[PDB]
Amino acid sequence: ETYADIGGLDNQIQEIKESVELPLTHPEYYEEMGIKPPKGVILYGPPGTGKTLLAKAVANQTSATFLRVVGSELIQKYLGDGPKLVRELFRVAEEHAPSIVFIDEIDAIGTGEREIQRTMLELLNQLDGFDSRGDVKVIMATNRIETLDPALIRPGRIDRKIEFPLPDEKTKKRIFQIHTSRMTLADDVTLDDLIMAKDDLSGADIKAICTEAGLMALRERRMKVTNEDFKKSKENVLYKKQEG
């Protein structure tokens, strides 16, 4: 799962590649310009689930320090300490300057409640660079671009924004091609009904049925993918999210 493994959006992934791989890397075309917009790009996707967004943010994992603050889950599951956790992540990001701060599944306003507004306004104040400079990049990702309030736009996006097209079975075709690039299975497995089986799904539950397809197919001690065991294991995922 690298930046060159997925297809159909190579321009959209070389835009974030050439955009967030600009600072601290390839310095011959970085210091002569002297712009340095330390804001980073903002990702989104109607499918979301972190699989496509993680497939876009995986470009930084090539050569960099691993650091990903996925969502505000730890902000709401803990006591109302406020922005001091973001200050600790920002000072360890200061001590870890060759990094890229990535945020996935932003569920601050999408999901006490009055503290989310003040920790989001203070999060905006610290993210804008009130007492900082172009040290680390910030990439924001979520399930809907409309979840970001207009407050988080003008001082939260000054670098670049992108648009994610509908899957149209091409992101699903490339994701399924990657999931079938390592396993051994013929073309007897119908693609359309399984990539569009429930309503639509890019990579998450097809990765799940690939995991329980390798395991469930390993239960029969045969590496071949039976035409009835794959859909027989698919009935569990199709039935799970529809019964309750």
Partner: protein, 686 residues
């Protein structure tokens, strides 16, 4: 099927019942039985019973080998005289004969030390040559020459499988766990099967480990018969040691058959193509000479600038940036800066004379001494600058030819059991000048000359320097750098008796006992000698605070190949120099995340010895993640040694003895700045 009709057939002692019941067991032996052979409790009485007795012995060893037995399995087969690609043959031959002959060769090989084990072992050899399971029956038949006729009996068609796989993992595991007397059989039998086969460079590695003179001639007539050239000349001249390049240059001084074996064997063809290849494909920026050559001051950062300058050989601007740069420097800075023009010109043998001739016979002693050192550094095969410096040699108190003896004996030692310089080095060691670097570059000179000898030597060279070493127990630095050359002459492994002789005569007061543990350091290049590991842990708690540094420092040389075990818990100790032992034990490898993880903790220290020792290994282990630790050094510092050495790392960022000697001799930098004249001439830095 059920055992109701066939189970009571083994109870009677009738001969026909055996001669027809046993073939039925041979027919049903393809799957063994319906169960785990629980008939032993009923057929165990047939042990004392004996026409077709080999079949009864085969069934007995089949069931005893089937349920459990450790010694009684191969006896019915060594007494049976076996007689009379299938599943049955794979079952009773592959695993039952693999483990069977494995425990027979194990019990007989470890018990006594006949022809039965040879016939069974060759029968399993051919049967597994038919079964064609690689490295498994081999890895089982390693420890039981037998291996010679085994490999030359098996290496007929499969070349890259047994050679690449068996020689790769069995070479790594052979140098890791297998002792030396079997590794020599790997080298001779591999010399045979690799001499008869292709892939010469692995046989050249066999010449690196064997250190033989016939292998280079056989690989020169065999590589000459089958004709790239410059590459095998490069790692040919770099792979060869001090012995076989002078023996090679004398046999090729004899015949050479093409003039190209001395053309390549001379230091002109490994260096003449590099200049256009280095200048063309690379383009270095000038901001390092301008910046790193601009923030230098205090007459020590300028020494770091003579280091950056000297170790630059494209651009030659900082080399010829005006004059007075050498005059403003110090005396030892006049030695290092005088040798800088020699370190920047390890090319263009024609122009070396007309470039170094400017500083020759100048008005200053250090300019001409460092100029002769420059003439010794620029080349290693010209040997035409010896006479004007080595000729006179008559000082006897202080005269210039002593520093010219440093540069000329040291540079000639880098250029080189030749007596044409050792006979002149006898009055050098017999002089015993108060200058430490005299016996420094003399002991290191004769040491680097004497590495790679046939089982070393205990002649009047090391005997003379030991008698004259113990003659005067003053200036213990002599008792520190003399064991360097001693241990250099101790090379020649193969269970030589030099360690025992040194253990008999050298054992004295802890200075020559420190020499003894230095002989223990250089005497353990590597083998299966776990006694050195339990002895390492036992002696690791010694009160002497230097044999821990050197003897514990030997860890980076003993286990230098299996780097998975090199990281240890030395950092958790409380010794004053154990963090230096692990810090130097890091080395100069590719610098994985574990190494930089150790440098993250070793970088922050309060004493200037560790803060000065950390940038050398930090920049040698990594040749947007290189200058970041240097920025960390800027955050720690912002003394003189930390700034000069941190700039030395600023430019250092971007089993041959030549790459193992210089730093091991450099382990005594915690002294006067007199050593800094020898600090910049390290030859291990590529």
């Amino acid at each position: 099927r059920d055992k109701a009709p066939v189970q009571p057939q083994q109870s009677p002692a009738a001969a026909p019942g055996g001669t027809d019941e046993k073939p039925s067991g041979k027919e049903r032996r393809d799957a063994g039985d319906k169960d785990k052979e629980q008939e032993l409790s009923e057929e165990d009485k047939q042990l004392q019973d004996e026409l077709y007795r080999p079949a009864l012995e085969e069934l007995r060893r089949q069931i005893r080998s089937s349920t459990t037995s450790m010694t009684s399995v191969p006896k019915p087969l060594k007494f049976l005289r076996p007689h009379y690609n299938k599943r049955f043959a794979a079952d009773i031959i592959s695993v039952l004969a693999m483990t069977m002959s494995g425990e027979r060769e194990c019990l007989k090989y470890r018990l006594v030390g006949a022809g039965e084990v040879a016939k069974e072992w060759q029968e399993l050899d051919d049967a597994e040559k038919v079964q064609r399971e690689p490295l498994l029956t081999l890895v089982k038949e390693i420890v039981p020459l037998l291996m010679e006729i085994e490999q030359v009996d098996m290496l007929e068609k499969d070349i890259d499988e047994n050679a690449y796989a068996k020689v790769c993992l069995y070479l790594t595991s052979c140098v890791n766990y297998v002792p030396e007397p079997e590794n020599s059989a790997l080298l001779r039998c591999a010399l045979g099967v690799f001499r008869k086969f292709s892939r010469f460079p692995e046989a050249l590695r066999l010449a690196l480990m064997l250190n033989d003179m016939e292998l280079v001639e056989d690989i020169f007539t065999s590589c000459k018969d089958v004709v790239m050239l410059g590459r095998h000349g490069v790692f040919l001249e770099l792979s060869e040691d001090v012995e076989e390049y002078e023996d090679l240059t004398e046999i090729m001084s004899n015949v050479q058959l093409n003039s190209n074996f001395l053309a390549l064997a001379r230091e002109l063809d490994i260096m003449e193509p590099k200049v256009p290849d280095d200048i063309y494909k690379t383009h270095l920026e000038n901001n390092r000479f301008g910046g790193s050559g601009s923030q230098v001051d205090s007459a020590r950062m300028n020494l770091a600038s003579s280091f950056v300058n000297g170790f630059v050989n494209q651009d030659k601007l900082l080399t010829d940036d005006g004059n007075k740069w050498l005059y403003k420097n110090k005396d030892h800075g006049m030695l290092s800066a005088a040798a800088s023009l020699g370190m920047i010109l390890l090319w263009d043998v024609d122009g070396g004379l007309t470039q170094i001739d400017k500083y020759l016979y100048s008005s200053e002693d250090y300019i001409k001494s460092g100029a002769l050192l420059a003439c010794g550094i620029v080349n290693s095969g010209v040997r035409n600058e010896c006479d004007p410096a080595l000729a006179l040699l008559s000082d006897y108190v202080l005269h210039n030819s002593n520093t010219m003896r440093l540069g000329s004996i040291f540079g000639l030692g880098l250029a080189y059991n030749r007596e044409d310089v050792l006979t002149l080095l006898l009055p050098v060691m017999g002089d015993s000048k108060s200058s430490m670097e005299v016996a420094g570059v003399t002991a290191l000179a004769c040491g680097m000359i004497a590495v790679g000898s046939c089982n070393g030597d205990v002649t009047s060279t090391i005997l003379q320097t030991i008698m004259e070493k113990s003659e005067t127990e003053l200036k213990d630095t002599y008792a520190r750098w003399l064991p360097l050359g001693l241990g250099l002459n101790h090379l020649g492994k193969g269970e030589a008796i030099e360690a025992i002789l040194a253990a008999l005569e050298v054992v004295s007061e802890p200075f020559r006992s420190f020499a003894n543990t230095l002989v223990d350091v250089c005497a353990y290049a590597g083998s299966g000698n776990v006694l050195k590991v339990q002895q390492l842990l036992h002696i690791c708690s010694e009160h002497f605070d230097s044999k821990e540094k050197e003897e514990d420092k030997d860890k980076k040389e003993k286990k230098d190949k299996d780097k998975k075990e090199a990281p240890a818990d030395m950092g958790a100790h409380q010794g004053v120099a154990v963090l230096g032992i692990a810090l130097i034990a890091m080395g100069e490898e590719i610098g994985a995340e574990m190494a930089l993880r150790t440098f993250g903790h070793l970088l922050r220290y309060g004493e200037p010895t560790l803060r000065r020792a950390v940038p050398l290994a930090l920049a040698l282990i990594s040749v947007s993640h290189d200058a970041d630790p240097e920025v960390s050094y800027n955050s720690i510092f912002a003394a003189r040694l930390a700034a000069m050495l941190r700039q030395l790392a600023q430019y250092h960022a971007k089993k041959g003895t030549l790459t193992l000697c210089p730093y091991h001799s450099d382990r005594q930098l915690m002294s006067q700045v007199a050593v800094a004249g020898l600090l910049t001439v390290l030859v291990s830095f590529l």
